[PDB]
């Protein structure tokens, strides 16, 4: 059931036709950007994981 399992993939990702698998192990993920903001009794601190 193609239309069922095709819906599970995320909206941003649309994969191409071919895939040359040449191993018994494949990592899959995404490269996201995190913008953290910290606050406590001592004070405030702002950072960013690129």
């Amino acid at each position: 059931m193609s239309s069922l399992l095709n819906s599970l993939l995320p909206e941003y990702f649309k994969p191409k036709t071919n895939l040359n698998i040449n191993s018994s192990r494949v990592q899959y993920g995404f490269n996201a950007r995190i913008d953290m903001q910290y606050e406590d009794d001592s004070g405030t601190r702002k950072g960013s994981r690129p």
Binding site: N31, A32, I34, D35, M36, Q37, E39, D40, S42, G47
Partner: protein
């Protein structure tokens, strides 16, 4: 890069003694602090997925 409660590896009830002196610094952004004080607030945003 996340923490699940099942990493404790003990079903049931317990109390934890956290070592605050031996807090190593593996990956440091500008946000990263070692000494928390009072009520800790962390607000993060995730954008730019690929």
């Amino acid at each position: 890069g996340r923490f699940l409660y099942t990493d404790v590896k003990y079903e049931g009830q317990t109390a934890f003694l956290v070592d605050m002196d031996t807090v190593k610094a593996r990956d440091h952004c500008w946000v990263s602090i070692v000494d928390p004080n009072g009520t800790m607030n962390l607000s993060y945003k995730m954008t730019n997925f690929r």
